Ligand binder design. Sequence first.
Ligand SMILES: CSc1ccccc1CC(=O)N1CCC[C@@H]1c1cnc[nH]1
Ligand SMILES: [Zn+2]
Length: 140
Amino acid sequence: SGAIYVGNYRVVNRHLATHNDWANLVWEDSSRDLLVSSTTAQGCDTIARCDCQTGVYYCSSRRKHYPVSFSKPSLIFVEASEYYPARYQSHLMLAVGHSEPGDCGGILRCQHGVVGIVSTGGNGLVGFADVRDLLWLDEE
Ligand SMILES: CSc1ccccc1CC(=O)N1CCC[C@@H]1c1cnc[nH]1
Ligand SMILES: [Zn+2]
């Protein structure tokens, strides 16, 4: 579990969104596994606006933050789960790192701020849904 709190927005994995998220929806995209809802309080996270390929992510199944090198956001074939069958996930970046079921949400950050959140993985991989192209998170 986990979310990004920027301005009056809450960014979560679409598959973990609650009823309150759907009842206060701003934007959602199933191909990216992202959903954004509105919040009453202002958040403290800052979004990175950059093309970094090195950063640090939080792994809840190890209670640890790990430094990683990650790929540029791309369209990659991901296999099935209980929440999704097998499909092209867009705007996804991959790194070598431990992940297991439950870690979806954890933040990936670079020197500029938040880059994205944990979405997929396995086999010593961990994927992350990028949010650096969502410029509107910085305003209104
Ligand atoms: C870090 S998640 C993970 C890590 C190691 C192994 C398996 C997972 C589960 C997983 O990938 N899930 C469950 C919802 C999203 C994603 C998914 C993508 N497309 C279908 N399933
Ligand atoms: Zn950066």
